[PDB]
Symmetry: D3
């Protein structure tokens, strides 16, 4: 391999410069198969990669793992191999009551409740998505009959206390994060996820473009964790593939 974790060489990407980067290694294939001549490339650790062709141009599909540290490796190592555009597709918990389960979120920027983003810029720097790629995501959403929620996402290094979940072993949240959900609600923050703060900060600062679209799987104003009663439309995966086509055409 040309890179230390992903098991990939430059040749294996066949010139791809755009990556679709889901969180879950098990989603990779399905995303890939929405495009042409999808091919398995590698699987190492949380990093499963496929190659596919979007209207004839190579796209790499590579999972990140949960959270900013595994994301950071993925994004660096793909860029080492010539990727300069990273489209994240993900799942997310809504924190606003009007954002329904099954709705899609396009994140313009993120609250940096992570540590990896600080390793690319001080906290003063905005974890902001690339304008053209965000535009492409919005457009793919609307083309699909869906108006996305567009706004700010709370991007937390944890799933439990940092997203102010109480149904845990201790049922306690450290002071900084106690009441924090309300803080972000009040500020109009749409949702919680775990990677976009790192992805956006690292891409804005290193000269790469990123965007993120995500499907809402739970509304935190009603459940901490979704279950079988949770509402079971258009898919964030289809949208991202459509967005990638826009950007490569």
């Amino acid at each position: 391999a040309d890179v230390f974790h992903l098991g990939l060489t430059k040749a294996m990407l066949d010139g791809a410069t755009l990556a679709i980067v889901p969180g879950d290694p098990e989603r990779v294939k399905r995303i890939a198969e929405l495009m042409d001549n999808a091919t398995f490339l590698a699987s190492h650790r949380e990093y499963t990669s496929y190659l596919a062709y979007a209207d004839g141009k190579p796209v790499v599909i590579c999972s990140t793992g949960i959270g900013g540290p595994s994301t950071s490796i993925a994004v660096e190592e793909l860029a080492q191999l010539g990727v300069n555009t990273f489209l994240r597709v993900g799942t997310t918990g809504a924190i606003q009551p009007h954002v329904n389960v099954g709705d899609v979120i396009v994140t313009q920027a993120s609250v940096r409740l992570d540590g990896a983003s600080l390793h690319f810029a001080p906290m003063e720097f905005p974890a902001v998505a690339n304008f053209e790629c965000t535009t492409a995501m919005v457009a793919a959403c609307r083309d699909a009959g869906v108006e996305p929620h567009i706004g700010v996402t709370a991007s937390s290094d944890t799933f439990y206390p940092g997203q102010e979940r109480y149904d845990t072993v201790t049922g306690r949240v450290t002071r900084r994060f106690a009441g924090s959900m309300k803080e972000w609600q009040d500020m109009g923050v749409l949702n919680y996820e775990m990677e976009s703060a790192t992805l956006f900060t690292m891409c804005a600062t290193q000269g790469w473009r990123a965007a993120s679209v995500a499907g809402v799987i739970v509304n935190r104003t009603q459940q901490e964790i979704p279950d079988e009663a949770t509402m079971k439309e258009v898919s964030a995966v289809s949208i991202v593939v459509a967005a990638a086509k826009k950007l490569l055409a």
Copy 2:
């Protein structure tokens, strides 16, 4: 008046929901006369306001003064009068060699080198402009034959040390800010101004829409003080008409 500083009452605004907010009280009239039926509203301290109409729609034009603290008062008091959309038009120093004096920057989001932003959200919160309004600014640039630089802006509470100007009385920059310009350059930050970090944070947290377009009057890879020597204001008025259509 029904607000504390601006000298305005709601009826004065004729239903305006959108403000164009330059820093310079003297730009207010000149923005306003690009529009129709320019009407003086009030002038107190650094806050001169005009009502004018953009293709039949009322728009307030209200200066902010230099910097976030005075901006925060104007944005708040306007919003108390029904303003929910704030378009900043400003001047700026570029810090990338590829950005020319005369060019326009549309700021997607801002590095928070201000303090007023912290009175609306802790630092982790992004100082991000509204997507729809930024889209409008970009379209207004392009409808005018201008390709804007669209990126991040360093928004500083000072013009001198925080923008790492050395041509001062003491010629020193405190440690945090020494080497800072290069830091932001390396990060692909386009430019320096003084208001957008506050403007964006307070609008994003308070449920209002903001965007900012600015004319590049100095390139900091060349010199500190801008040469005395429009495009930006015509773009903002163009964008206001897009948003109010």
Copy 3:
């Protein structure tokens, strides 16, 4: 213009080394006319400047605008023209019950609830007024038969949330400022304003002298000319 924002040259100051720096451009003329031979210098943006003469010596009167950022420009650019002493005058809202409307506050140092101070020193550095000029303000107070409240002022980048006002469109105060007025009250802080943290920190760290006097117009728990006559008296004291 020798200087980019104020539209002043050094020659226009006639060697003035002391400035009175109110916040409001519209109050500069009237301050200036308390001294001799007041003359209009320039008006750009929020910066209106006058020259006048106190007991024969020139004194510049220049408005700062509201808040540290605009103040930091005025101060730096006046200093480039040879100013080395800056006397702030203004109004304020008190937060202690024993500080009545019609009193005078002399700020000895400020809680740094601003950003611009940090562009001159890290937060550990105290936002402290100059001893000599503070002393002159006190003395001018007492000459006018006013025993001033001498203490700490909370110097905020905002008028609204940073001063824990809830009479706003959203009625929300961010967490860090929720309960903050009471925090400052308990610590004996006298009042809120919006420029002294910046002014003080920048003058202390750059070698200039600063002090600040303000008339209490309102008390958050429950004169204008007085504050101006005192600052003019203080200027004379310092230039004598």
Copy 4:
């Protein structure tokens, strides 16, 4: 499942109260096989879990993925299933010249160069391992003829800039981390890894025991990335299994 990510129920753990938690899902099976009746439980995302028995006592082996956010989910979820003891096993880069490739480090505490620890305790709290489990890990190294390095570890949310690697696409490290390796070096910090600060802080604060043994795969005073010239003793996985047995006996 009774936890949201791991796909596990409490019954699947056969009363296990201790987990060994490597980072790589592909290493779980292997570690499980140094114990008895190795039994696959689940595999979801980067989280592969096995049950095995260590001199008769049940032990869960579960991958964390890279970094503290993924680790934090596994640790919380295991603990909801009754685990109260977490033994990290992993690889590390040494930052002292006398810490050799092949050596093992038992971390007593970590420099918190992470975000996830702060969702458990403010930065003043020490990211300290449990004394008893640290002692057993030392004892298990010595039992095997290995004298471990015992000291402080730099625990970084990133592999690249936060570990002051410069062989990257931009070759730049943000101000805060430029020169940081020498700061940790000078302080006698032994090594870099990417999970222990989160693990330790989250366990110390929630009432669980944790410890970490790791093998040194590169010395950063000589190479950023190990390659085929790099040296390649008793394994860190052997030690951890040995520690587990001690602790459960």
Copy 5:
């Protein structure tokens, strides 16, 4: 003197490489007298120092005063004199209800509620004790019939607001320390003392060994002020173990 505050020369230490460092200058002599040939060395400011012998080997016993800043001077100056190992012995207030007055706490690491620690490393660095010396302390406890409580200690620059005492002139704690005791309790923190964050951070960063044992003189789940030692016997036993 060879150093700026302690009034000590390197010769006076007779090759001692290990110090016992109590907080209280008046405990110094009592500790020294549990060893052989105890000899007053010096007394300046809060720094009272003795020499004594543990199974033939010299040990310096030198007080620190209360708090990190005076501790930082003493540890630095002793180390200038060849000391590489610093065993703190002290008093403390327990914040967990299962810890009794008269019990002993061995601090593995400390919450850095101090400022001097920052002068050796940024806050991210753990205020962690030396493994070997802690081991010695635990072992000394157990040989004495005392099971020590081993864990995390809140190491505070103040006795009053920083340990969230309210029985004070103003009866107020600044926001950051309001609720803080409950915070640390919830995180399993055992106790409050005033020196260990600084001692541990400075030793760990500068290549010296340190450990701390303390007698529990109050339980804060019951009251603020202690009612009017075995910790000293234990630390002397630990020094013996380390020197043997």
Copy 6:
């Protein structure tokens, strides 16, 4: 006792509202004997306390130990017995080339390089002396024919690395403190000491008055001075209590 560390009761102070607070226990008696009817009160740990009379008004002289933490205990326990004014006296190293050995400093406010100040107010609060006590100190200087340097002091929790000293075992200064003396020097800071941040902040926030005078005995850039600064502080006490 009333108070746990100092071993004092209120009665013992004979109504004293003002303490002189030097660092060294050994120095208390001698400072007390510049006043009348010096009277031993107590001695525990590094806290030696004396009562004496300053032009017929009761004054406590109480040592603090080195540094903020031990000072915070003394000032709190004294305040619990009615003391509302605290005058710090001591020696210091100057960092400005214009401040000569034997000069006197009156600290108007301090750089907070200390942790205890944070246990009273967040860092944005200034570590400022009381104006009236500062004025008294300045007057006492001038009555003794001394013009004091009046400005900002860097108040450090360490003697060595926080004062950017490299004459240490390791010879190392952590990054934050690397180049820090030059930093303070450029800002006009006069000197380093180790207590005034703490004393100033706790006093300002708790409603008590404080000030600090120090005799310059070393200058980083280059007995009798000690005595001068002690005479000045006794003189200021007299002025304040008049």
